[PDB]
Design an enzyme around this catalytic site. Structure first.
Site, mmCIF file in Angstrom:
data_model
loop_
_atom_site.group_PDB
_atom_site.id
_atom_site.type_symbol
_atom_site.label_atom_id
_atom_site.label_comp_id
_atom_site.label_asym_id
_atom_site.label_seq_id
_atom_site.Cartn_x
_atom_site.Cartn_y
_atom_site.Cartn_z
ATOM 1 N N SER A 1 -39.010 24.718 -41.750
ATOM 2 C CA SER A 1 -40.029 25.617 -42.286
ATOM 3 C C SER A 1 -39.488 26.415 -43.470
ATOM 4 O O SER A 1 -40.255 26.911 -44.296
ATOM 5 C CB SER A 1 -40.541 26.562 -41.198
ATOM 6 O OG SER A 1 -41.231 25.848 -40.186
ATOM 7 N N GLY B 1 -33.428 20.570 -31.161
ATOM 8 C CA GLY B 1 -34.843 20.852 -31.380
ATOM 9 C C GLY B 1 -35.694 19.596 -31.412
ATOM 10 O O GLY B 1 -36.713 19.512 -30.720
ATOM 11 N N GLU C 1 2.937 5.912 -5.839
ATOM 12 C CA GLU C 1 3.364 4.668 -5.211
ATOM 13 C C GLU C 1 4.127 3.791 -6.204
ATOM 14 O O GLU C 1 5.184 3.259 -5.871
ATOM 15 C CB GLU C 1 2.174 3.906 -4.627
ATOM 16 C CG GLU C 1 2.569 2.716 -3.763
ATOM 17 C CD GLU C 1 1.462 1.687 -3.617
ATOM 18 O OE1 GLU C 1 1.379 1.054 -2.543
ATOM 19 O OE2 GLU C 1 0.683 1.499 -4.577
ATOM 20 N N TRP D 1 0.636 4.503 3.294
ATOM 21 C CA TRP D 1 1.472 3.589 4.079
ATOM 22 C C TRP D 1 1.750 4.034 5.518
ATOM 23 O O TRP D 1 2.391 3.308 6.277
ATOM 24 C CB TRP D 1 2.795 3.306 3.354
ATOM 25 C CG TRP D 1 2.664 2.327 2.225
ATOM 26 C CD1 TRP D 1 2.907 2.566 0.903
ATOM 27 C CD2 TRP D 1 2.245 0.958 2.317
ATOM 28 N NE1 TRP D 1 2.673 1.429 0.165
ATOM 29 C CE2 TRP D 1 2.263 0.428 1.006
ATOM 30 C CE3 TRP D 1 1.858 0.124 3.380
ATOM 31 C CZ2 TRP D 1 1.910 -0.899 0.727
ATOM 32 C CZ3 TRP D 1 1.508 -1.195 3.102
ATOM 33 C CH2 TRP D 1 1.533 -1.691 1.784
ATOM 34 N N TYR E 1 8.377 -5.044 -1.522
ATOM 35 C CA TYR E 1 7.924 -4.520 -2.805
ATOM 36 C C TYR E 1 9.085 -4.058 -3.682
ATOM 37 O O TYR E 1 9.858 -4.876 -4.180
ATOM 38 C CB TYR E 1 6.923 -3.383 -2.583
ATOM 39 C CG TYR E 1 5.633 -3.817 -1.943
ATOM 40 C CD1 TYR E 1 4.797 -4.732 -2.582
ATOM 41 C CD2 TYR E 1 5.235 -3.308 -0.709
ATOM 42 C CE1 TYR E 1 3.604 -5.133 -2.008
ATOM 43 C CE2 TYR E 1 4.039 -3.703 -0.125
ATOM 44 C CZ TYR E 1 3.226 -4.615 -0.780
ATOM 45 O OH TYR E 1 2.036 -5.016 -0.212
ATOM 46 N N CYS F 1 1.123 -7.973 -0.476
ATOM 47 C CA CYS F 1 -0.116 -8.583 -0.929
ATOM 48 C C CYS F 1 -0.005 -8.946 -2.393
ATOM 49 O O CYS F 1 -0.126 -10.117 -2.754
ATOM 50 C CB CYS F 1 -1.302 -7.676 -0.667
ATOM 51 S SG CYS F 1 -1.579 -7.506 1.101
ATOM 52 N N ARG G 1 -2.169 -12.192 -2.825
ATOM 53 C CA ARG G 1 -2.527 -13.156 -1.778
ATOM 54 C C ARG G 1 -3.707 -12.708 -0.922
ATOM 55 O O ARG G 1 -4.499 -13.532 -0.458
ATOM 56 C CB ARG G 1 -1.324 -13.453 -0.877
ATOM 57 C CG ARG G 1 -0.762 -12.236 -0.161
ATOM 58 C CD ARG G 1 0.080 -12.617 1.044
ATOM 59 N NE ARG G 1 0.447 -11.432 1.815
ATOM 60 C CZ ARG G 1 -0.246 -10.955 2.844
ATOM 61 N NH1 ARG G 1 -1.350 -11.567 3.253
ATOM 62 N NH2 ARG G 1 0.174 -9.867 3.472
ATOM 63 N N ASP H 1 -8.236 -6.572 -0.269
ATOM 64 C CA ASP H 1 -9.285 -5.740 0.302
ATOM 65 C C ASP H 1 -10.126 -5.188 -0.844
ATOM 66 O O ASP H 1 -9.766 -4.182 -1.462
ATOM 67 C CB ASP H 1 -8.671 -4.607 1.132
ATOM 68 C CG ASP H 1 -9.717 -3.751 1.844
ATOM 69 O OD1 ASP H 1 -10.932 -3.882 1.562
ATOM 70 O OD2 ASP H 1 -9.308 -2.930 2.696
ATOM 71 N N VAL I 1 -14.192 -8.564 1.777
ATOM 72 C CA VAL I 1 -14.709 -7.248 2.143
ATOM 73 C C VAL I 1 -14.871 -7.192 3.666
ATOM 74 O O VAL I 1 -15.374 -8.135 4.278
ATOM 75 C CB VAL I 1 -16.025 -6.893 1.391
ATOM 76 C CG1 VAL I 1 -16.636 -8.113 0.717
ATOM 77 C CG2 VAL I 1 -17.035 -6.203 2.301
#
Ligand SMILES: NC(=O)C1=CN([C@@H]2O[C@H](COP(=O)(O)OP(=O)(O)OC[C@H]3O[C@@H](n4cnc5c(N)ncnc54)[C@H](OP(=O)(O)O)[C@@H]3O)[C@@H](O)[C@H]2O)C=CC1
Ligand SMILES: NC(=O)C1=CN([C@@H]2O[C@H](COP(=O)(O)OP(=O)(O)OC[C@H]3O[C@@H](n4cnc5c(N)ncnc54)[C@H](OP(=O)(O)O)[C@@H]3O)[C@@H](O)[C@H]2O)C=CC1
Ligand SMILES: C#CCN(Cc1ccc2[nH]c(N)nc(=O)c2c1)c1ccc(C(=O)N[C@@H](CCC(=O)O)C(=O)O)cc1
Ligand SMILES: C#CCN(Cc1ccc2[nH]c(N)nc(=O)c2c1)c1ccc(C(=O)N[C@@H](CCC(=O)O)C(=O)O)cc1
Ligand SMILES: Nc1ncc(N2CCN(c3ccc(Cl)c(Cl)c3)CC2)c(N)n1
Ligand SMILES: Nc1ncc(N2CCN(c3ccc(Cl)c(Cl)c3)CC2)c(N)n1
Ligand SMILES: O=c1ccn([C@H]2C[C@H](O)[C@@H](COP(=O)(O)O)O2)c(=O)[nH]1
Ligand SMILES: O=c1ccn([C@H]2C[C@H](O)[C@@H](COP(=O)(O)O)O2)c(=O)[nH]1
Lengths: 510, 508
Positions: A74, A125, A281, A303, A329, A389, A410, A413, A452
């Site tokens: 304006s 706006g 970990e 664990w 591991y 795993c 291998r 989950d 799963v």
């Protein structure tokens, strides 16, 4: 029929001090340009913006080239802008309207046959007005994953759940995650909802043949869709089997995922991943530490259920102390084949240091194809609390000093372990990349028995209803101090722009 | 505009003694029925056949239901057929014509608005006539992979290169290999040739070599290998290499092959099967003497066990032919202290093969059925670090066995087709010994690459369309009860019709 185009923090923040909250996001500007400029000839697109938005733009870029520029104001007058800079030949003259309904009528009156697509470009706006009029069909939102200081905000809207946790606007497009100047972002498009192969086709016809994650999202660029489609896949097409734990399983064999590490970090957003855990970990692995009580003392109990007196006995290891995973591991990683006694022994110099071998090979001979690290030791399996795993990982360097990593697992989950494993090895890649003066590129996940558990099914079905958020960036702090893989601490990492959906409770099949 | 529909041996054979050369192929009969019957209402399809074809069909099935049957014959008459068996409700009266042109004229004259598609169904007179007239737009060929005694053959045609080695008919469809009654076959279709607002975002996100691009449906599982070749050449990165020879490589690639119907012994170039079988038996023995393979005409390990290569590996105490503690060794004696290729290691180390098998036989839902050749403690003693280093097994609901094999380094040109066959055979062998059905082999690849001196030959290979996969049969099943009971002569490859061998040098 109008389309809105925005860049936004998770809390709807768009601006501060008549300027953008973040550093320059080059890809975002490429995106803004391309969407607003492109047309099939005779026509051009219009950009309708507020007065302050106009004034926030630097001189040389205004008006926006090859687009009709309308400024809702304006106070500002058409001659004010004309006097600002000489109108370049072939470009449209900058118009000014009193309101948004005014700007739309001007488009209808004097610009029919002349304009194609109308884009509301800001600020708060005009965004609020366009939403109030309900004239917006689509929202082009760039989700800035980080939160910045902001004084101006995009209004709240039905379906703003795509930004952060709490006629609708539903996502129909979600891209992969980009990053500029340490800022992660992605691109979504929301929508207002409320005889060639014909003869080949009958052979096709007889040979040819329920749960999907966010089915409305048609373009699935986001790399987390891999994981979400993987859950659906297993539930749809997986086989119900018996299992060591006694708990039911729907399983599949030989599944796969891959994630980019060059722009952002694959810490899954469709549920909150316990990052303190992965980090603590991983570092624990790197020490060659085999005492679960060191993790348990830091609040990382991941664990504990597998190192109890009861579980150690069901494993025929009565001579193990509570918290002793055996030589698994980290131990095989740093001391492959070394004779194990207990978690309290010093194994320094014993066995093969696989990690040091990989790193040295990466630093001297990066084209070698024997850069592998294995936790699988058939001689020592009966001595571990649980056989590994994630049992193998391989490294690869390309033309451009870019590091990629494959990890074979291998047993996966999907519900609980997978998101964690993705984060854990993706972090390892970042760490090794830094130490060997390399750029992290890609993490590749090779999966064996992919399953799963039956008690996760309901929770995962809820998770599939959530659309992923942009991935975070993970920054290595203190880069100058860290020179070897053993130099990393728990305080050398920064997660930036992590805005996941709420935690989902899932019981660990014991 | 006509379509032909056929079943054919690699040597074009189609009939013997006015009957079919092979045992019953149920999937082909389902195919035949579906293609010839399907229509979008008002119309039906026409089947044109010769007299002897008509006579070859058993009574109950003739005329072919829900299809206008046209027999070509100067001897047979429309009333002969009418009297043969009473015309059933809603079925067309069988028509007889003196020639193929005549039958097509009858379809134009009396059957416009009535018939949709016309199908030439056989035999030797009609197929040749239709090809001569050039009225066949599409050929529906079922390629029977086995050869059978035949007295009636489908005519030679431009583009019969899809059947065996030597206007055109080019494949536009190749399916996966099926099998019924010990006969492998697949299906090809040949052809006479001679939310918009999403898009602007898609475009800015965006930025050559393809195998048999004209084939649009790519059902044959070998397309995985062929597309993998194209993918590396197009998108792979040129790299330095151990062998000094150039390499174009990708990282972390996957393939999977069904083992329930046929066997993935690649057809786009002949694979040295004698080699895969001899080496695999050699692995299962735990044998580390490459001279035992070399004596059998299998020289795949010779270049890597020479006096020279052994010394370049700093193993001067190794007798020529000694791979050190290689795959075979690690499988049956993991972690055993190696001396030489002449020592007996019975009872030493871990027998991973025996553990995997017993676990498959007693507890098939166990998730630790793995066999690894990667022993970081012994790598420096081996002539070559193992490429295929790990395999994992899986049994489902229906006693069906699947096998994953992780390989760290893949010579796509030379090694990969060999490795696919090798572990697919292992799965067959292990399935048999554990009373199981072979279902699937899954190939996980690390460093996937093609050597620069192979690229030219591989491009030639990509111009070849795959043939149906052969069947691998275990002979003397009753005699074989343990994994060590398999000999070289317990196997039979059935209906293997590959293209010619391609010479590719091993990067030493
Ligand atoms: N990242 C992103 O997506 C974007 C961020 N921004 C940021 O946001 C800020 C600009 O937003 P904001 O402060 O809201 O500025 P605006 O562009 O909304 O400016 C307000 C001015 O525009 C006109 N105007 C606004 N609303 C109305 C209305 N309802 N009716 C009539 N006229 C109206 C008026 O002009 P007059 O004074 O003449 O009456 C008013 O003074 C900047 O800091 C910028 O950096 C801006 C655009 C996009
Ligand atoms: N594999 C497959 O897909 C098929 C295989 N077959 C096999 O083939 C065998 C028979 O095939 P085939 O020997 O070719 O018999 P045909 O089906 O070609 O029939 C031959 C007879 O049909 C008439 N005929 C056909 N073509 C012409 C022509 N151009 N001009 C005039 N008359 C013609 C003649 O009838 P007349 O002498 O009475 O005047 C001739 O004797 C069957 O027994 C079956 O085993 C058959 C069909 C499909
Ligand atoms: C994988 C792995 C490492 N491990 C080790 C570990 C050990 C035995 C296992 N056993 C089973 N059956 N599933 C597992 O996922 C598993 C994981 C973990 C163990 C527990 C949690 C856990 O309780 N969940 C976290 C949430 C983390 C996430 O979102 O994934 C928590 O909040 O407690 C995570 C990781
Ligand atoms: C893989 C593997 C096992 N091996 C062992 C082996 C050892 C070292 C190697 N080294 C390199 N660089 N590439 C290989 O493929 C390779 C293979 C083989 C070795 C050679 C041949 C060979 O000369 N080609 C066969 C053709 C077989 C085929 O089609 O694959 C031949 O006809 O001689 C095959 C397999
Ligand atoms: N994704 C997305 N990014 C930026 C914007 N804009 C917000 C501010 N803006 C702009 C243009 C140019 C400059 Cl140089 C500056 Cl400082 C601001 C106009 C375009 C948007 N609407 N959407
Ligand atoms: N692909 C392809 N398969 C089978 C046929 N045939 C169909 C006609 N035919 C036939 C049909 C049914 C029966 Cl019961 C008998 Cl005995 C013979 C002979 C072989 C073909 N034309 N094409
Ligand atoms: O890093 C890991 C370790 C374990 N598991 C899960 C997968 C299996 O469900 C279980 C392994 O126990 P077994 O079923 O293999 O005994 O733990 C993971 O997902 N990731
Ligand atoms: O079973 C095998 C063994 C080796 N190779 C190929 C892959 C590599 O190109 C080369 C081995 O070289 P290094 O992995 O030693 O670098 O041979 C195979 O394809 N299959």
């Amino acid at each position: 029929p109008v389309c809105l185009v925005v860049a936004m923090t998770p809390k709807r923040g768009i601006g501060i001090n008549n300027g953008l909250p973040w550093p320059h996001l080059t890809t975002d500007f490429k995106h803004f340009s391309r969407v607003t400029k492109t047309t099939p000839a005779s026509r051009f697109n219009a950009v309708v913006m507020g007065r302050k938005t106009w004034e926030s733009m630097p001189r040389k870029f205004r008006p926006l080239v090859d687009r009709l520029n309308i400024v809702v104001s304006s106070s500002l007058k058409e001659e004010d802008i004309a006097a600002e800079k000489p109108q370049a030949e072939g470009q449209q003259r900058v118009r000014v309207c009193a309101s948004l309904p005014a700007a739309l009528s001007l488009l209808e009156e004097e610009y029919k046959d002349s304009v194609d697509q109308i884009f509301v470009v800001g600020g708060a706006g005009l965004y609020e007005a366009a939403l109030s009029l309900g004239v917006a069909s689509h929202l082009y939102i760039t989700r800035v994953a980080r939160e910045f200081p902001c004084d101006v905000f995009f209004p709240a809207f039905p379906g703003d759940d795509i930004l952060s946790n709490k006629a609708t606007y539903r996502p129909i497009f979600i891209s992969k995650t980009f990053s500029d100047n340490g800022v992660p972002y992605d691109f979504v498009v929301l929508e207002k909802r409320r005889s060639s192969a014909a003869a080949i086709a009958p052979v096709l016809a007889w040979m040819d043949e329920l749960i999907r994650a966010v089915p409305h999202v048609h373009f699935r660029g986001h790399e987390e869709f891999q994981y979400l489609d993987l859950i659906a896949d297993i539930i749809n097409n997986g086989r119900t089997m018996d299992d060591r734990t006694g708990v039911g399983v729907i399983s599949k064999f030989g599944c796969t995922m891959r994630y980019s590490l060059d722009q952002a970090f694959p810490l899954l957003t469709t549920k909150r991943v316990f990052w303190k855990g992965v980090l603590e970990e991983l570092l624990w692995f790197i020490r060659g530490d085999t005492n679960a009580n060191h993790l348990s003392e830091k609040g990382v109990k991941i664990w504990d259920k597998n190192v109890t007196r009861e579980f150690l006995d069901s494993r025929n290891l009565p001579h193990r102390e509570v918290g002793d995973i055996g030589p698994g591991y980290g131990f095989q990683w740093r001391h492959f084949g070394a004779a194990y006694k207990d978690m309290h022994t010093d194994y320094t110099g014993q066995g093969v240091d696989q990690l040091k071998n990989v790193i040295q090979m990466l630093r001297t001979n990066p084209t070698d194809r024997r850069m592998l690290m294995t936790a699988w030791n058939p001689a020592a399996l009966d001595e571990m609390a649980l056989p590994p795993c994630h049992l193998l990982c391989q490294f690869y360097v390309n033309d451009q000093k870019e590091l990629s990593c494959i990890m074979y697992q291998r047993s996966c989950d999907v519900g609980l372990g997978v998101p964690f494993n993705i984060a854990s090895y993706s972090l390892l890649t970042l760490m090794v990349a830094h130490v060997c003066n390399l750029k992290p590129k890609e993490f590749i996940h090779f999966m064996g028995n992919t399953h799963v558990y039956t008690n996760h099914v309901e929770a995962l079905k809820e998770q599939l209803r959530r659309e992923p958020r942009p991935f975070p960036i993970v920054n290595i702090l203190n880069k100058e101090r860290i020179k070897e893989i053993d130099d990393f601490t728990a305080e050398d990492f920064e997660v930036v722009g992590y805005v996941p959906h709420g935690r989902i409770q899932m019981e660990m099949a014991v």
